[PDB]
Amino acid sequence: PQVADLKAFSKHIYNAYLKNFNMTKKKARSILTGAPFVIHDIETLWQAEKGLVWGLPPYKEISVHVFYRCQCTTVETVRELTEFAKSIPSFSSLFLNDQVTLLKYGVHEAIFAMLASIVNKDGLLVANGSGFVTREFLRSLRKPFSDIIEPKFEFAVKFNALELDDSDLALFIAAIILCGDRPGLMNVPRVEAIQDTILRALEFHLQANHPDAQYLFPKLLQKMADLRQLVTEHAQMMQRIKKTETETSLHPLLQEIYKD
Ligand SMILES: CCCCCCCN(CCc1ccc(O[C@@](C)(CC)C(=O)O)cc1)C(=O)Nc1ccc(F)cc1F
Ligand SMILES: CCCCCCCO[C@@H]1O[C@H](CO)C(O)C(O)C1O
Numbered sequence: 729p730q731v732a733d734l735k736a737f738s739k740h741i742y743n744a745y746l747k748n749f750n751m752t753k754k755k756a757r758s759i760l761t762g763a764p765f766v767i768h769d770i771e772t773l774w775q776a777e778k779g780l781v782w783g784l785p786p787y788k789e790i791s792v793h794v795f796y797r798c799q800c801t802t803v804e805t806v807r808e809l810t811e812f813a814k815s816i817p818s819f820s821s822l823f824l825n826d827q828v829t830l831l832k833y834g835v836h837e838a839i840f841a842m843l844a845s846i847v848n849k850d851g852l853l854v855a856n857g858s859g860f861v862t863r864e865f866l867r868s869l870r871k872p873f874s875d876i877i878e879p880k881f882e883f884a885v886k887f888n889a890l891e892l893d894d895s896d897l898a899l900f901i902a903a904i905i906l907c908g909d910r911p912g913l914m915n916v917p918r919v920e921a922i923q924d925t926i927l928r929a930l931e932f933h934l935q936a937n938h939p940d941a942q943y944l945f946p947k948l949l950q951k952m953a954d955l956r957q958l959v960t961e962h963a964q965m966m967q968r969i970k971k972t973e974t975e976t977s978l979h980p981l982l983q984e985i986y987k988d
Contacts, residue, residue: 907919
């Protein structure tokens with residue numbers, strides 16, 4: 729009945745996910761278990777840069793160059809998240825303006841959620857798996873660039889402890905985007921209703937895919953809550969970069985998200 733009709737709904741979201749995201753956690757963990765060129769310093773960064781692994785703003789500095797790469801990566805993940813969102817029927821039913829409102833306020837949360845998929849205790853994949861940047865190298869970046877990405881690792885390791893597969897993620901992400909709590913959201917009841925359908929689908933999907941997993945569901949709800957905080961602290965550091973990092977330019981689409 730309920731538990732039957734939702735299976736469908738869940739598989740459909742999983743297909744949108746497989747169809748749209750550049751990198752699946754399956755593909756990610758694989759590469760991270762088994763190779764990618766390791767970037768742990770300037771030498772290897774310049775190396776990776778040239779041809780080793782790899783249209784950015786004019787060079788300016790090491791730490792900033794990385795910041796720019798982060799931007800390029802984020803912009804690309806925002807494009808996927810958008811396509812993924814549109815691949816969910818109920819999401820497209822919404823007026824174009826509300827769709828943009830959900831993406832505007834939910835993508836970073838989604839992005840940091842998925843970041844966990846390509847991240848292990850020591851670093852993270854880059855360039856479609858082609859390379860691996862060390863966590864220690866990021867930490868060495870001149871501040872404030874060295875602070876921004878570190879909290880994400882902390883988040884990611886705990887998150888990865890839940891051992892979620894791509895099918896769980898598709899639903900988890902969907903839940904994040906379809907959140908009726910977003911500012912200026914127009915058809916709040918509609919969004920809320922879709923979110924609920926997603927959460928119920930998620931739970932049923934979890935007791936199936938993770939039989940013996942104790943408190944998985946409510947734990948995921950807390951993670952959503954955490955991502956909300958993670959993004960908030962991220963936005964704060966971002967305002968500090970816009971204030972003090974006068975020379976560092978910001979991608980237009982990213983400024984639109986961070987303006988209000
Ligand atoms: C050696 C090259 C190093 C490359 C490092 C790239 C690290 N980085 C960006 C994290 C980040 C950093 C800053 C960030 O801040 C900005 C301002 C900039 C994008 C934003 O909030 O939009 C947002 C997000 C990622 O790998 N991101 C990433 C990739 C796939 C995915 F599914 C989810 C992800 F978060
Ligand atoms: C590509 C989908 C994700 C887009 C995220 C960025 C959206 O920015 C917002 O665009 C709205 C509609 O145009 C406004 O009117 C704003 O004021 C604004 O900041």
